[PDB]
Write an enzyme that holds these catalytic residues in place. Structure first.
Site, PDB file in Angstrom:
ATOM      1  N   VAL I  46       0.842  -1.180   0.000  1.00  0.00           N
ATOM      2  CA  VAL I  46       0.000   0.000   0.000  1.00  0.00           C
ATOM      3  C   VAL I  46       0.890   1.248   0.000  1.00  0.00           C
ATOM      4  O   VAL I  46       2.025   1.215   0.493  1.00  0.00           O
ATOM      5  CB  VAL I  46      -0.951  -0.005   1.232  1.00  0.00           C
ATOM      6  CG1 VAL I  46      -0.155   0.161   2.527  1.00  0.00           C
ATOM      7  CG2 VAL I  46      -2.009   1.077   1.073  1.00  0.00           C
ATOM      8  N   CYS I  47       0.378   2.338  -0.572  1.00  0.00           N
ATOM      9  CA  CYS I  47       1.116   3.600  -0.652  1.00  0.00           C
ATOM     10  C   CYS I  47       1.442   4.201   0.713  1.00  0.00           C
ATOM     11  O   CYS I  47       0.565   4.374   1.564  1.00  0.00           O
ATOM     12  CB  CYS I  47       0.342   4.619  -1.497  1.00  0.00           C
ATOM     13  SG  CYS I  47       0.317   4.229  -3.263  1.00  0.00           S
ATOM     14  N   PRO I  48       2.720   4.540   0.926  1.00  0.00           N
ATOM     15  CA  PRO I  48       3.258   5.122   2.159  1.00  0.00           C
ATOM     16  C   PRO I  48       2.689   6.500   2.447  1.00  0.00           C
ATOM     17  O   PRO I  48       3.182   7.220   3.311  1.00  0.00           O
ATOM     18  CB  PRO I  48       4.756   5.177   1.883  1.00  0.00           C
ATOM     19  CG  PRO I  48       4.960   4.126   0.817  1.00  0.00           C
ATOM     20  CD  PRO I  48       3.788   4.361  -0.066  1.00  0.00           C
TER      21      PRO I  48
END
Ligand SMILES: [Cl-]
Ligand SMILES: [Cl-]
Ligand SMILES: [Cl-]
Ligand SMILES: [Cl-]
Ligand SMILES: [Cl-]
Ligand SMILES: [Cl-]
Ligand SMILES: [Cl-]
Ligand SMILES: [Cl-]
Ligand SMILES: [Cl-]
Ligand SMILES: [Cl-]
Lengths: 173, 161, 165, 169, 166, 170, 170, 166, 171, 167
Positions: I46-48
């Site tokens: 998942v995107c940080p």
């Protein structure tokens, strides 16, 4: 060892009246009053008058439904050597009383008569009733002899109360 | 009661050779070899012997810097009654050995010779050296006599070293 | 390890008389008298003699329904190697006695013969009767040899009381 | 509890003095004389007196032999008084020559092992303490069995005898 | 049994010196040099004196690199001697250049967690202690698997390399 | 601890399979083959692959002798992947033929007594489990000392030798 | 120990009945009526039994309202009698209409937490148990402070009021 | 425990003073006068102020006899205020001449053994502490049974009597 | 980890903003407000975005006397590795925030954010005041992102109560 | 107190002042099926901070719209809650609430969620979100003077539901 509580059961070797070695138990007497009494050692440097007095009044006791029996921390064998010597020469001579021998010390302890420090018993005297309950405690010091007649008084006294429904005031009868 | 470890200290009444009643202690012997040996009861039906053998060889032992002493759970008194009765009539007769009496059983226990079940000691024999250390353990059953000569062998043997 | 109480059970490797490696147990002897004796170490500087005397009188012992067996905290292999050296050159030579080896020290402790400090056993000797009960205790210091004849005396003595009395 | 030849259990509690005062008595007070401590169950008992009295009377005779005696029960100091006011003739107790301990706390009875935890009263116990403060005689009679005061005396005399004989330098 | 980078378990017991004396050796004695402690089960084995020897031989090669080596087993100092007397040629061991520890006590085997409580002997363990007295390598081979002495060296050299540059 | 000749500590945790999947691997899965479990401190170390790789390569050679190998460290399955994506040429790790265990729990490192509680990472440990699931070899190298894979093999072969006949000792 | 709205501590011990008998009374005997248990220190005091008496007198008045009352002290049943024989006129107590508990055991005093362990006697405690055998009122006066019997009544009536209807005030 | 003739349990907590301030009151503050501490279950109870009030009123009469009184409940100081703001006429409480303790902690109720652990509120307890700070009277009424303030007075006077004379 | 009680002291390795490896301690910040926040693992799929949002508003935070710092049970090196990848390709890219790494897990446990079962931390966020006391607890489940603006609101809110004695109610 | 995430939330069962005016004993299991928002506040007639309490009551409708029920809690008596609900919101009061108001005179609940300040005896501004399966999924504890942002609570609930719906 409490009063009105079943006396401590003892079961050990005893030098019978005659000369046998029989293992005696307090339950054996269930039915009669019993007089258990202790003495320190066996080959005492004095007059075994105390121990003897009981043996003699043994008859008189039996007459009143009570059996008596001695006890000390000496060996069954030691008892006899003492019973073999003639009463006349500081001996004990034939007893009409069984002589308990708890080499184990289990009995002395049970009645709280043992002097842990020395390893011998004090002059104790207990009266167990026919139902097997302790009803009298008496512990004399090591040099103080007992009065057998008193023991009797007490037994009679006890029986009086069992027979009738009243008590016994000071110095009875 | 371990080997090469100071023997258990004993301090109790003993019927001296003569006829006195003296309280003997293992530290009293600090300087000589000691032979402590136990026996069950006193007026043992049929069995005397062993105890005597020691009393006799007592002289022979003393000759080799060793003192011997008996012990049993009988009273200083019940036993005396045994030093005067004649050896000839199943008695013991005068002993040259002090006779310990631990009515307390403290000693028998200390040497692990006591039979808790019966209340008497087994035929135990221990040899303490002059420094007060235990150097020999021997425990014979109740019916098996000991060989005094052997005890000596052992003492001499120890001294040799 | 009390008298008149079943002797401590031992079950460990032993260098049989011949040369085999067999695990021996005290229950194996149930039926005969047994003489268990201990010795400190194996090769040592003068400690043959005693061990041997037993091996020799082994015959004499067997004659009286008693089997004997040694024990020490040395390996079964160390025993062998000592049995290979000729008795004449400070060796031990063939034994008629099985030689216990408790690398575990479990046995020494069981008989209260172990010197926890050094890790070896004292000159202990015990006699177990045919019913498997301990009936004789003897513990000699490390430098004091034992008298095998005495051990016999004791065994015979014990048997005497078995028949009679 | 109490062993023989071991300093008797110290007791320190209210007592109805001979005269009529309320004084707190202690066993150490008697250090020097022989003491006879004896127990009784309850106070206005139809027939517990007699025994109690006998002691009070032989009190003189006892004193004659260096021994002081003192009673004890789990009743209140006030209850003792009340019982002492009633005339001996009408089932009362009448003036005593003996101090009467009252351990409302039961601490004493327990100390001598004379207490019947179930009922809360003491058994007919009798103890003899020597001049050095050590217990030298134990006697415990059941609740219905009276004691023989003469015997207590015998015992005390007996004890003293052994003291006189065998001694110092 | 023992932790890395933590002062190695101190051992202090009898050892059969190279020559023939009986000296009590301690790990602190070596404070200053690398030490190689290695264990073996029993003494008068079957086919495994090989291993023990290899060390004794490379002993020189080891000393060359500031490292001393020493064996250990639960056999008696006397048992060690007797084995050192037999000629290497006849299944013996012959003179060793390595001191041979003897912990009749088993205290050492336990300290290094090499003891097989069930049998009473040690496994083929090998440990490397650095000059500061800290344990820096653990190796424990099963009872039938011999060790590679060259490797032990590799490791020692390897260790020294790091202390050197960094 | 757990010891030698005693069933090796069971491990059951996520591992980055050879290909690229995320599968939960267990030591019992290997019941039948020899297994080589080895640990390493951290993942993107400046000099820890060398060693890790050597195993991956000799993986084939190992498989040839009935033995499977598997790594382990206290890093996340995801961290392993990353590292596996970077090309071996640029200090990366590149595709491995070995499953890579990840015990974020540290349960494994502790089980084999390879964990440095103080830092939280494992020492260079290597263990050989036999086909019956028993531990038969312990090796723990310090943090800066690489291992010799050939030796591990020697040891495995050596073990197998004794399982056929008597015994070895080179 | 004793909590409110919790079954009052059961007491079972000797008591000097109104007439002159010695009967062993138990709190369960009263299951059905309200009970008023009250304590007093000692028996033969230099004080005036007024307090103890007041209860005995209002005994009738109490009975009228379904409540029975009973005293208690650590004195012997025999001591109670003796005190009951002396004529009220000469500092005595005279016949009581209330049973007089005697816990030579002190078990009761302790149960109600009215015992002064130090002295061995009870404080002027008063408790009201309801017909279901539950404790509903606690009152403990110091040793020199008399109680107000009328209040005890007020409280009882007060309690009963709530039984029929649903709430009260001062 | 809180025993008789033993120093009453010290209490130290917030209280809604007579006027309207919030002050932390302690039992030691009263060392010198007799104190009447009394408890009540909850605050906004449709019926049963009456009791609380009676005390506030006889407050004067009490003060006349060297005794100070103070209430207590497990309700917040703020809850007390809010109740004091509502006019006595509309089921309120209205200004009190008595400080009103608030032990949100329940520490006090427990100290005096008046807390009903099950419900979390106190029973109608009333205690009288003497000028030396010792507890000399215990009274615990059930939750629905009101108290008789006059009696509390009787008791106080009664106590003082024995003090003066005697 | 109680409120108004000195926050649990943390002292461990952290990947500084630039690229150094420095051991950071909570006492270092004694004087400023601190925002400690946790995240599970490093190279997730998942995107940080969450982690990043903090790094960006880092400036805005600093403006209000507060320093922020991340933390997870990943190695300092792993953080490094994640910081090198360009934000554009699912990476993280240079952070303005120090990134704690407790390989020991001691921190996560100290703040009661560790999921003993998995070995990683929950989305926790704590606010320590300048005197070093904990004044805000927030723990989001593993899939629920946080609202940085809110963290700010809270910080400002806390500070308000400092300047003035009044209280900052609902908003 | 133990209140771990993804673990069944601590069961609460105690008196509550229902929306209308009744006194009903409410339990967390009653809500098994909906999302629940439990939130605490220190005291009742607090000099201020009802605003916060109210905001919830108002957004009650908006919450209900999203399958979530909300309920307050404090260590004050059910009666004290009522009395506060009677005073008109305009005069610093609270006025009728659409939310049930828990009252744990026992403090059992505050302790269960670890929101109690043992020293003072009141709870901190805590907020927890329990999912329909009865598991705790959000922890938030604000200091005593810092108000909460109800919108955020919603964000979170919606956020949770999203993950549920999807994956
Ligand atoms: Cl008794
Ligand atoms: Cl020994
Ligand atoms: Cl024995
Ligand atoms: Cl005695
Ligand atoms: Cl380690
Ligand atoms: Cl191992
Ligand atoms: Cl209560
Ligand atoms: Cl009290
Ligand atoms: Cl908190
Ligand atoms: Cl959690």
């Amino acid at each position: 060892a409490k009063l009105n509580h079943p006396a401590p059961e003892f079961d050990d070797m005893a030098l019978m009246p005659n000369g046998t070695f029989k293992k005696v138990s307090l339950s054996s007497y269930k039915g009669k009053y019993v007089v258990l009494f202790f003495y320190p050692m066996d080959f005492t440097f004095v007059c075994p008058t105390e121990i003897i007095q009981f043996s003699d009044d043994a008859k008189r006791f039996a007459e009143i439904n009570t059996e008596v029996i001695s006890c000390s921390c000496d060996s069954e064998y030691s008892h006899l050597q003492w019973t073999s010597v003639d009463r006349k020469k500081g001996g004990l001579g034939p007893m009409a009383i069984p002589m308990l021998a708890d080499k184990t010390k289990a009995i002395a302890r049970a009645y709280g008569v043992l002097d842990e420090d020395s390893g011998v018993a004090y002059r104790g005297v207990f009266i167990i009733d026919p139902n097997g309950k302790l009803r009298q405690i008496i512990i004399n010091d090591m040099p103080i002899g007992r009065n057998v007649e008193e023991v009797i008084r007490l037994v009679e006294a006890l029986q009086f109360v069992e027979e009738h429904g009243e008590v016994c005031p000071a110095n009875w009868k």
